[PDB]
Structures are given as C-alpha cells and as structure tokens.
C-alpha cells in the first residue's frame, strides 16, 4: 500500500522446533531459541536450544523441569553483568539459565505473596529491570491455564533488588513486550501486546516497577485468529511486531497508531524476532513450519541491555 509492504528475502536458519520462540543472542554472539511446545507423553517437555548459525544444527542445552513438572519456555532476554539467559516459562514462571544448561526457578510467589503466573516474554530496560508478560495462570503444580479466552493475564517487573512485582492484571493474553528509552538511556515507555484483541498497550515508566497512564497505543491489522506476538525496536525506535496469523510483521513508528509499513513473510505465523547485534539482520521464529528464518531490515536493531556496559563512560 499505504500501508506500504516490503518483501525482503527470508533465508532459512533452522527447522523442526515446536512452537519456536524467544530468539536471543548472548554476550558471545551465540544464538538460542526456545521450543515451548515440545511434549513427551502429552505433558510439557519444552526445550532451550543453542543453534549453530553456520550449519543450522541444534543442541538442547536445557529441558527444564521442577519437581517433575516440565517447562514451557517461551521468551528470553540475555543478562548484562553475567552471560546468562532470563527465560519466561508458561509453567515455571521466570527461569535463569546458564550456558552449561543448568537453571534456577526465580519465583513461586510474587512480592505480595500471590502465586506466580506462567510467563511468555520479557524485556530488560537499561536500568536492569525486567518487564515480563504472564498470560498463563498459576505456575506448576497448578493445572495449566492460559488467558486466550478470559482476562486473567498479568504483567510483572522483576527488579534489580530482586522483587517480583505484579504491575498490572486482567489482560487477554499479554504476549510481546518492549521498553522504549530516551536517547540518554532513560526508560520511559512500556509496550505490551495483547494478542487476540489486536491491541498494543502503552504505559509511562515512572521508575522501577512503576507504570502509569495505560493507553491503547497501537492497532494490529486483521481479524484472523492470533495477533501481536513478539516485538523489538530498531535503532530509530520503530517497533517491529510479529502478527501471528497474518503473514506479516508490522512496523510502527515512534508514535504508534497504525503500522507505517508491513513486512510480508513467506509463512502465516511469525511468532518472535530478534536482531543480531551490530547488524540489520532480524531472526524470526514462526509456527506454520515451526522454523527459524532471517531477513535484512533497513537499519540496525536497538541495543539490548546485554549490549550496554555497567562501567561505560558515554
Ligand atoms: Ca510470545
Ligand atoms: Ca526479541
């Protein structure tokens, strides 16, 4: 159109990853994907994989389980001060995963003593606070439920001082999440996808675990089943959003509203995305083929927290 559509070349990266999700680079430039929807005997047995970008070969580094309850690991962020992954898990809540495949479960309960909810995606701000979507109901051992039909999905902030703070509730499947920063580095806006309602929500970030000014920020095209899944900013603060079921990734300008551009994908179900540091390359997971691809965007990605320096000067 208007809405203008681009059709970049998609190159295959790897295949056969059930529910392929949470693409992420670590501080060494290794690449990881999660496979939330792997099952064994009809029960969750989701996986965290390292992908060799040269070969497409997959290695399962972690198949998390707590007390026999398998995980549904669905979204990732790399830490800054240690080379470890924070992983949102729909059964287990928030995990911290090492490169050696060992892991720890961070919260059974929130800061107010409520049972933790299962999580789907997360985003670090540059202050090191981790903003997390929680579209599942209570974590294992509670029977699994998810908010695709009913409004019981929540949002958390896991803070630098170790608090797991519930910051909003009553979403119908909160999904992707991203933080906008001022040019100086200050976090100031949180964006949250609400998948089936075809909305992106915004908040003003007033401080760690302090959000206000909830607003319907963006509108996701289409009336397909699905909607916005994963998201990330480019270096100009355009927000790229996988629109699962639509065959497109939407591109929002800084001010939201309607997409300014769409990216046609050669598949119906883009799920999540991530830039390779220092490049224009976006890795995309998708659920039509349960596979991972890459394509070239117009500019580099916005730096993730793990690309910033604790002891930087400028
Ligand atoms: Ca997701
Ligand atoms: Ca991402």
């Amino acid at each position: 159109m208007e809405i203008p559509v681009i059709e970049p070349l998609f190159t295959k990266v790897t295949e056969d990853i059930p529910g392929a999700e949470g693409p992420v680079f670590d501080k060494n430039g290794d690449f990881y994907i999660v496979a939330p929807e792997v099952e064994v005997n009809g029960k969750p047995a989701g996986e965290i994989l390292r992908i060799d970008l040269k070969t497409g070969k997959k290695t399962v580094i972690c198949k998390p389980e707590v007390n026999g309850y398998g995980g549904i690991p669905a979204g990732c962020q790399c830490d800054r001060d240690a080379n470890q992954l924070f992983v949102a898990d729909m059964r287990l809540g928030l995990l911290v995963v090492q490169t050696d495949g060992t892991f720890e479960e961070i919260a059974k309960k929130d800061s107010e003593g409520r049972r933790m909810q299962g999580c789907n995606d997360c985003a670090f701000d540059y202050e090191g606070n981790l903003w997390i979507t929680a579209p599942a109901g209570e974590v294992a051992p509670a029977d699994y439920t998810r908010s695709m039909q009913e409004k019981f999905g929540s949002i958390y902030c896991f803070t630098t001082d170790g608090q797991m703070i519930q910051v909003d509730t009553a979403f119908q499947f909160p999904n992707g999440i991203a933080v906008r920063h001022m040019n100086d580095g200050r976090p100031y806006q949180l964006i949250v996808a609400e998948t089936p309602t075809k909305k992106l929500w915004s908040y003003d970030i007033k401080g760690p675990a302090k959000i206000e000014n909830k607003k319907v920020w963006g509108h996701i095209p289409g009336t397909h089943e699905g909607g916005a899944d994963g998201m990330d900013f480019d270096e100009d603060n355009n927000l790229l959003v996988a629109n699962w079921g639509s065959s497109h990734i939407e591109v929002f300008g800084p001010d939201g509203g309607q997409p300014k551009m769409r990216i046609r994908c050669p598949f119906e179900k883009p799920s999540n995305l991530h830039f390779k540091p220092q490049t224009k390359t976006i890795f995309v997971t998708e659920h039509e083929n349960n596979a991972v691809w890459k394509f070239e965007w117009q500019r580099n990605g916005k730096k993730q927290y793990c690309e910033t320096l604790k002891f930087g000067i400028f």
Side-chain angles (χ1 to χ4, degrees), residues 73-280:
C76 305
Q77 292 282 268
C78 190
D79 198 20
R80 184 193 69 192
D81 293 341
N83 192 46
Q84 60 191 352
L85 302 179
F86 283 75
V87 179
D89 188 302
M90 295 279 284
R91 293 294 294 146
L92 304 176
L94 184 66
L95 311 178
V96 174
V97 181
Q98 306 301 316
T99 58
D100 68 3
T102 62
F103 76 101
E104 294 287 346
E105 196 176 36
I106 304 173
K108 293 184 183 305
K109 296 175 171 159
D110 70 22
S111 59
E112 291 294 308
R114 293 177 290 234
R115 299 171 238 283
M116 185 66 203
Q117 292 177 237
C119 296
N120 195 277
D121 211 351
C122 60
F124 275 119
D125 69 33
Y126 290 159
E127 291 303 311
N129 295 305
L130 186 67
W131 302 87
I132 308 162
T133 60
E138 295 165 314
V139 293
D143 192 49
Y144 176 63
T145 61
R146 284 179 298 108
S147 61
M148 200 64 80
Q149 292 176 20
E150 295 280 354
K151 297 187 184 193
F152 61 81
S154 299
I155 312 297
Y156 297 87
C157 183
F158 180 66
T159 65
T160 56
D161 63 320
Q163 302 190 60
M164 179 65 78
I165 303 175
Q166 193 176 76
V167 295
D168 206 1
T169 200
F171 276 71
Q172 201 178 329
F173 215 94
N175 200 340
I177 187 160
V179 176
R180 186 187 308 286
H181 295 88
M182 296 295 259
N183 286 356
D184 69 14
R186 182 191 314 91
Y188 75 109
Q189 185 179 63
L190 187 68
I191 307 295
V192 178
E194 188 184 37
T195 300
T197 68
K198 306 297 192 299
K199 293 174 189 163
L200 304 179
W201 294 87
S202 62
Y203 304 81
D204 293 335
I205 299 170
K206 296 316 311 127
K210 293 291 192 203
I211 48 170
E212 299 177 3
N213 204 2
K214 182 174 179 172
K215 175 170 72 189
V216 180
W217 183 90
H219 295 281
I220 298 292
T223 56
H224 54 281
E225 289 298 307
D229 187 343
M231 64 180 57
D232 271 314
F233 285 109
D234 78 9
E235 69 173 16
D236 289 2
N237 303 311
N238 303 304
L239 187 71
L240 293 87
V241 182
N243 180 4
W244 190 111
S246 76
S247 309
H248 295 77
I249 296 162
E250 313 300 348
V251 185
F252 294 86
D255 297 320
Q258 293 286 155
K260 70 180 170 174
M261 174 183 352
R262 319 184 74 197
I263 309 164
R264 185 59 166 262
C265 300
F267 40 80
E268 184 159 358
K269 295 167 177 177
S271 168
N272 213 338
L273 56 85
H274 213 70
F275 286 83
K276 180 184 167 184
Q278 298 282 123
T279 79
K280 305 184 179 62

Side-chain angles (χ1 to χ4, degrees), residues 47-63:
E47 296 175 344
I48 307 172
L49 304 97
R50 191 182 287 112
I51 314 300
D52 182 340
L53 290 185
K54 295 223 188 343
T55 69
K57 289 175 150 197
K58 304 175 291 174
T59 300
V60 176
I61 68 164
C62 182
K63 194 173 171 75

Side-chain angles (χ1 to χ4, degrees), residues 248-310:
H248 295 77
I249 296 162
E250 313 300 348
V251 185
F252 294 86
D255 297 320
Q258 293 286 155
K260 70 180 170 174
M261 174 183 352
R262 319 184 74 197
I263 309 164
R264 185 59 166 262
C265 300
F267 40 80
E268 184 159 358
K269 295 167 177 177
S271 168
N272 213 338
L273 56 85
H274 213 70
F275 286 83
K276 180 184 167 184
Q278 298 282 123
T279 79
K280 305 184 179 62
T281 309
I282 301 180
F283 288 73
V284 185
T285 69
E286 59 90 356
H287 301 167
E288 171 169 328
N289 308 290
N290 293 293
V292 188
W293 305 78
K294 63 177 177 169
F295 74 95
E296 300 297 291
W297 180 234
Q298 299 183 342
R299 62 191 63 77
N300 288 2
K302 188 78 186 206
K303 285 183 171 174
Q304 292 271 288
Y305 173 60
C306 65
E307 297 174 70
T308 72
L309 289 173
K310 181 171 172 63

